[PDB]
């Protein structure tokens, strides 16, 4: 509900170093492909960060309703971006409870 947006502009970006930074399986993308992401030039890119449960990662898709997608983080129907998701149990969980 209080997710942060960071503006990225006026730089060159290499997208082959993403896989060495976070332990995710693969990209999921809408409108583009991750293989050809380094073959063209953009205007502006933004980054969003939040943490949700494993049952609500399906609500980070366009045209989907639910709990997170209806009241916390709604995506456009013409979304042309790529969403990365990975598991983090050693940093986002505590034996006493990460509240």
């Amino acid at each position: 509900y209080a997710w942060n947006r960071k503006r990225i502009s006026n730089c060159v970006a290499d997208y082959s170093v993403i896989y060495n930074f976070a332990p995710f399986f693969a990209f999921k993308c809408y409108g583009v492909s991750p293989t050809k992401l380094n073959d063209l030039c953009f205007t502006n890119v933004y980054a969003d960060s939040f943490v949700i449960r494993g049952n609500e990662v399906s609500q980070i898709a366009p045209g989907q309703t639910g709990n997170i997608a209806d009241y916390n983080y709604k995506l456009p129907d013409d979304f042309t971006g790529c969403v990365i998701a990975w598991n983090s149990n050693k940093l986002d969980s505590k034996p006493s409870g990460n509240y």
């Binding site: 896989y19 976070a22 332990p23 995710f24 399986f25 990975w86 598991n87």
Partner: protein, 50 residues
């Protein structure tokens, strides 16, 4: 072994098939049937039904 699931080892074994261009050398365990002639019949010649 303490790494994440994205950096975990994977053992990949892929199979490449070759379509029927030669005499077939690998086929399944089905028993053959004796040939019939001059009758309306269903056939199966190395996987080619009809």
């Amino acid at each position: 072994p303490t790494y994440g699931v994205g950096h975990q080892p994977y053992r990949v074994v892929v199979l490449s098939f070759e379509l029927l261009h030669a005499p077939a050398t690998v086929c399944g365990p089905k028993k053959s049937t004796n040939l019939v002639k001059n009758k309306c019949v269903n056939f199966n010649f190395n996987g080619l039904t009809g």
